[PDB]
mmCIF file of all heavy atoms in Angstrom:
data_model
loop_
_atom_site.group_PDB
_atom_site.id
_atom_site.type_symbol
_atom_site.label_atom_id
_atom_site.label_comp_id
_atom_site.label_asym_id
_atom_site.label_seq_id
_atom_site.Cartn_x
_atom_site.Cartn_y
_atom_site.Cartn_z
ATOM 1 N N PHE A 1 0.822 -1.204 0.000
ATOM 2 C CA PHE A 1 0.000 0.000 0.000
ATOM 3 C C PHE A 1 0.858 1.256 0.000
ATOM 4 O O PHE A 1 0.483 2.268 -0.603
ATOM 5 C CB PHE A 1 -0.932 0.013 1.203
ATOM 6 C CG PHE A 1 -2.045 1.005 1.081
ATOM 7 C CD1 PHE A 1 -3.238 0.646 0.483
ATOM 8 C CD2 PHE A 1 -1.897 2.301 1.544
ATOM 9 C CE1 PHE A 1 -4.269 1.554 0.356
ATOM 10 C CE2 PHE A 1 -2.920 3.218 1.420
ATOM 11 C CZ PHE A 1 -4.109 2.841 0.827
ATOM 12 N N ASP A 2 1.995 1.215 0.696
ATOM 13 C CA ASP A 2 2.891 2.365 0.723
ATOM 14 C C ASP A 2 3.418 2.695 -0.665
ATOM 15 O O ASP A 2 3.532 3.872 -1.021
ATOM 16 C CB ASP A 2 4.050 2.101 1.683
ATOM 17 N N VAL A 3 3.727 1.675 -1.462
ATOM 18 C CA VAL A 3 4.164 1.952 -2.831
ATOM 19 C C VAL A 3 2.969 2.253 -3.744
ATOM 20 O O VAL A 3 3.080 3.058 -4.685
ATOM 21 C CB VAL A 3 5.022 0.792 -3.360
ATOM 22 C CG1 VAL A 3 5.740 1.194 -4.639
ATOM 23 C CG2 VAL A 3 6.035 0.375 -2.310
ATOM 24 N N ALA A 4 1.810 1.646 -3.478
ATOM 25 C CA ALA A 4 0.598 1.972 -4.215
ATOM 26 C C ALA A 4 0.181 3.421 -4.036
ATOM 27 O O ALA A 4 -0.411 3.995 -4.955
ATOM 28 C CB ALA A 4 -0.540 1.050 -3.781
ATOM 29 N N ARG A 5 0.505 4.018 -2.889
ATOM 30 C CA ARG A 5 0.187 5.412 -2.613
ATOM 31 C C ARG A 5 0.813 6.374 -3.616
ATOM 32 O O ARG A 5 0.260 7.454 -3.852
ATOM 33 C CB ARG A 5 0.651 5.752 -1.199
ATOM 34 C CG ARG A 5 0.035 6.995 -0.617
ATOM 35 C CD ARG A 5 0.628 7.274 0.750
ATOM 36 N NE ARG A 5 2.071 7.483 0.676
ATOM 37 C CZ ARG A 5 2.646 8.625 0.314
ATOM 38 N NH1 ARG A 5 1.904 9.677 -0.007
ATOM 39 N NH2 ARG A 5 3.969 8.718 0.274
ATOM 40 N N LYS A 6 1.942 6.007 -4.223
ATOM 41 C CA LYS A 6 2.580 6.828 -5.242
ATOM 42 C C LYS A 6 2.611 6.141 -6.602
ATOM 43 O O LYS A 6 3.238 6.654 -7.536
ATOM 44 C CB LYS A 6 3.992 7.210 -4.806
ATOM 45 C CG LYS A 6 4.957 6.048 -4.780
ATOM 46 C CD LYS A 6 6.284 6.469 -4.190
ATOM 47 C CE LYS A 6 6.189 6.565 -2.680
ATOM 48 N NZ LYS A 6 5.878 5.241 -2.072
ATOM 49 N N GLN A 7 1.969 4.964 -6.720
ATOM 50 C CA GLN A 7 1.703 4.327 -8.006
ATOM 51 C C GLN A 7 1.007 5.277 -8.973
ATOM 52 O O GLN A 7 0.260 6.167 -8.562
ATOM 53 C CB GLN A 7 0.837 3.088 -7.805
ATOM 54 C CG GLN A 7 1.617 1.803 -7.724
ATOM 55 C CD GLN A 7 2.575 1.629 -8.877
ATOM 56 O OE1 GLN A 7 2.162 1.341 -10.001
ATOM 57 N NE2 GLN A 7 3.864 1.795 -8.608
ATOM 58 N N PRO A 8 1.253 5.124 -10.279
ATOM 59 C CA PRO A 8 0.597 5.984 -11.275
ATOM 60 C C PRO A 8 -0.919 5.873 -11.331
ATOM 61 O O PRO A 8 -1.571 6.855 -11.703
ATOM 62 C CB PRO A 8 1.221 5.510 -12.591
ATOM 63 C CG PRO A 8 2.579 5.085 -12.200
ATOM 64 C CD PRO A 8 2.454 4.477 -10.832
ATOM 65 N N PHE A 9 -1.517 4.739 -10.976
ATOM 66 C CA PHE A 9 -2.967 4.607 -11.015
ATOM 67 C C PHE A 9 -3.633 5.081 -9.732
ATOM 68 O O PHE A 9 -4.734 4.621 -9.413
ATOM 69 C CB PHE A 9 -3.373 3.158 -11.307
ATOM 70 C CG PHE A 9 -2.606 2.132 -10.520
ATOM 71 C CD1 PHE A 9 -2.822 1.963 -9.161
ATOM 72 C CD2 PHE A 9 -1.689 1.312 -11.147
ATOM 73 C CE1 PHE A 9 -2.123 1.022 -8.444
ATOM 74 C CE2 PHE A 9 -0.992 0.363 -10.430
ATOM 75 C CZ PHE A 9 -1.217 0.224 -9.078
ATOM 76 N N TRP A 10 -2.993 5.988 -8.991
ATOM 77 C CA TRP A 10 -3.377 6.278 -7.616
ATOM 78 C C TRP A 10 -4.713 6.995 -7.533
ATOM 79 O O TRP A 10 -4.792 8.218 -7.674
ATOM 80 C CB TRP A 10 -2.289 7.102 -6.927
ATOM 81 C CG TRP A 10 -2.534 7.439 -5.484
ATOM 82 C CD1 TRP A 10 -2.421 8.670 -4.916
ATOM 83 C CD2 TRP A 10 -2.912 6.542 -4.424
ATOM 84 N NE1 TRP A 10 -2.706 8.602 -3.578
ATOM 85 C CE2 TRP A 10 -3.011 7.308 -3.252
ATOM 86 C CE3 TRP A 10 -3.183 5.171 -4.356
ATOM 87 C CZ2 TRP A 10 -3.367 6.752 -2.027
ATOM 88 C CZ3 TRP A 10 -3.530 4.622 -3.142
ATOM 89 C CH2 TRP A 10 -3.622 5.409 -1.993
ATOM 90 N N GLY A 11 -5.765 6.223 -7.297
ATOM 91 C CA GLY A 11 -7.094 6.759 -7.210
ATOM 92 C C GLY A 11 -7.703 6.543 -5.845
ATOM 93 O O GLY A 11 -7.393 5.584 -5.130
ATOM 94 N N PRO A 12 -8.577 7.465 -5.454
ATOM 95 C CA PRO A 12 -9.341 7.269 -4.216
ATOM 96 C C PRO A 12 -10.262 6.067 -4.279
ATOM 97 O O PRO A 12 -10.354 5.311 -3.304
ATOM 98 C CB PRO A 12 -10.123 8.582 -4.085
ATOM 99 C CG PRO A 12 -10.124 9.170 -5.461
ATOM 100 C CD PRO A 12 -8.837 8.772 -6.073
ATOM 101 N N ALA A 13 -10.934 5.855 -5.411
ATOM 102 C CA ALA A 13 -11.732 4.648 -5.583
ATOM 103 C C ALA A 13 -10.857 3.403 -5.591
ATOM 104 O O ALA A 13 -11.287 2.335 -5.138
ATOM 105 C CB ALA A 13 -12.546 4.740 -6.870
ATOM 106 N N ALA A 14 -9.626 3.528 -6.086
ATOM 107 C CA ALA A 14 -8.681 2.421 -6.015
ATOM 108 C C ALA A 14 -8.336 2.088 -4.572
ATOM 109 O O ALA A 14 -8.274 0.912 -4.198
ATOM 110 C CB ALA A 14 -7.421 2.761 -6.806
ATOM 111 N N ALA A 15 -8.118 3.110 -3.745
ATOM 112 C CA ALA A 15 -7.891 2.863 -2.326
ATOM 113 C C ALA A 15 -9.128 2.276 -1.660
ATOM 114 O O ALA A 15 -9.008 1.475 -0.727
ATOM 115 C CB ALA A 15 -7.471 4.155 -1.633
ATOM 116 N N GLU A 16 -10.317 2.650 -2.134
ATOM 117 C CA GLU A 16 -11.546 2.050 -1.621
ATOM 118 C C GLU A 16 -11.621 0.566 -1.949
ATOM 119 O O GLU A 16 -12.032 -0.241 -1.107
ATOM 120 C CB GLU A 16 -12.761 2.775 -2.195
ATOM 121 N N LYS A 17 -11.222 0.193 -3.160
ATOM 122 C CA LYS A 17 -11.184 -1.220 -3.512
ATOM 123 C C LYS A 17 -10.099 -1.951 -2.733
ATOM 124 O O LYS A 17 -10.252 -3.137 -2.406
ATOM 125 C CB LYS A 17 -10.973 -1.367 -5.013
ATOM 126 C CG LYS A 17 -12.076 -0.731 -5.817
ATOM 127 C CD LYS A 17 -11.631 -0.438 -7.226
ATOM 128 C CE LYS A 17 -12.708 0.325 -7.961
ATOM 129 N NZ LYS A 17 -13.184 1.468 -7.141
ATOM 130 N N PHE A 18 -8.995 -1.258 -2.435
ATOM 131 C CA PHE A 18 -7.980 -1.816 -1.548
ATOM 132 C C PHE A 18 -8.563 -2.110 -0.177
ATOM 133 O O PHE A 18 -8.305 -3.170 0.409
ATOM 134 C CB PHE A 18 -6.799 -0.858 -1.411
ATOM 135 C CG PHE A 18 -5.663 -1.168 -2.335
ATOM 136 C CD1 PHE A 18 -5.849 -1.167 -3.702
ATOM 137 C CD2 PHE A 18 -4.421 -1.512 -1.832
ATOM 138 C CE1 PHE A 18 -4.806 -1.471 -4.561
ATOM 139 C CE2 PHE A 18 -3.371 -1.815 -2.680
ATOM 140 C CZ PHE A 18 -3.565 -1.797 -4.048
ATOM 141 N N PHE A 19 -9.360 -1.178 0.340
ATOM 142 C CA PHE A 19 -10.064 -1.414 1.591
ATOM 143 C C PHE A 19 -11.004 -2.602 1.475
ATOM 144 O O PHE A 19 -11.116 -3.393 2.412
ATOM 145 C CB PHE A 19 -10.848 -0.173 2.009
ATOM 146 C CG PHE A 19 -12.042 -0.481 2.866
ATOM 147 C CD1 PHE A 19 -11.880 -0.939 4.170
ATOM 148 C CD2 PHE A 19 -13.325 -0.338 2.364
ATOM 149 C CE1 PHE A 19 -12.975 -1.236 4.953
ATOM 150 C CE2 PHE A 19 -14.423 -0.633 3.147
ATOM 151 C CZ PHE A 19 -14.249 -1.081 4.441
ATOM 152 N N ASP A 20 -11.696 -2.732 0.345
ATOM 153 C CA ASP A 20 -12.641 -3.833 0.185
ATOM 154 C C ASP A 20 -11.943 -5.188 0.214
ATOM 155 O O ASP A 20 -12.388 -6.103 0.925
ATOM 156 C CB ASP A 20 -13.422 -3.662 -1.116
ATOM 157 N N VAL A 21 -10.833 -5.324 -0.513
ATOM 158 C CA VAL A 21 -10.144 -6.612 -0.557
ATOM 159 C C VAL A 21 -9.439 -6.880 0.771
ATOM 160 O O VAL A 21 -9.293 -8.034 1.193
ATOM 161 C CB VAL A 21 -9.178 -6.675 -1.760
ATOM 162 C CG1 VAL A 21 -8.100 -5.607 -1.681
ATOM 163 C CG2 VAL A 21 -8.569 -8.071 -1.918
ATOM 164 N N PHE A 22 -9.034 -5.820 1.476
ATOM 165 C CA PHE A 22 -8.515 -6.017 2.823
ATOM 166 C C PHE A 22 -9.621 -6.417 3.788
ATOM 167 O O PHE A 22 -9.387 -7.205 4.711
ATOM 168 C CB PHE A 22 -7.819 -4.746 3.302
ATOM 169 C CG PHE A 22 -6.463 -4.539 2.699
ATOM 170 C CD1 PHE A 22 -5.935 -3.266 2.568
ATOM 171 C CD2 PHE A 22 -5.714 -5.619 2.267
ATOM 172 C CE1 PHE A 22 -4.681 -3.075 2.015
ATOM 173 C CE2 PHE A 22 -4.462 -5.437 1.719
ATOM 174 C CZ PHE A 22 -3.945 -4.164 1.589
ATOM 175 N N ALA A 23 -10.831 -5.900 3.575
ATOM 176 C CA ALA A 23 -11.968 -6.213 4.424
ATOM 177 C C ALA A 23 -12.465 -7.625 4.199
ATOM 178 O O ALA A 23 -13.125 -8.185 5.081
ATOM 179 C CB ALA A 23 -13.100 -5.216 4.172
ATOM 180 N N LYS A 24 -12.184 -8.198 3.035
ATOM 181 C CA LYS A 24 -12.399 -9.625 2.871
ATOM 182 C C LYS A 24 -11.490 -10.397 3.826
ATOM 183 O O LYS A 24 -10.365 -9.981 4.118
ATOM 184 C CB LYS A 24 -12.137 -10.048 1.427
ATOM 185 C CG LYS A 24 -12.941 -9.284 0.383
ATOM 186 C CD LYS A 24 -14.404 -9.127 0.779
ATOM 187 C CE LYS A 24 -15.035 -7.946 0.065
ATOM 188 N NZ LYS A 24 -16.345 -7.571 0.660
#
């Protein structure tokens, strides 16, 4: 996630999906 934070696809909805897969 720390590297995803500065990844080129860095979207708020992307972080939301990150939360979703972590919530699984």
Side-chain angles (χ1 to χ4, degrees), residues 1 3-15 17-19 21-24:
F1 196 89
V3 193
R5 198 183 60 81
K6 69 187 77 63
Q7 264 308 286
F9 45 72
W10 182 229
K17 299 159 186 49
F18 264 60
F19 154 70
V21 61
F22 284 154
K24 305 315 157 194

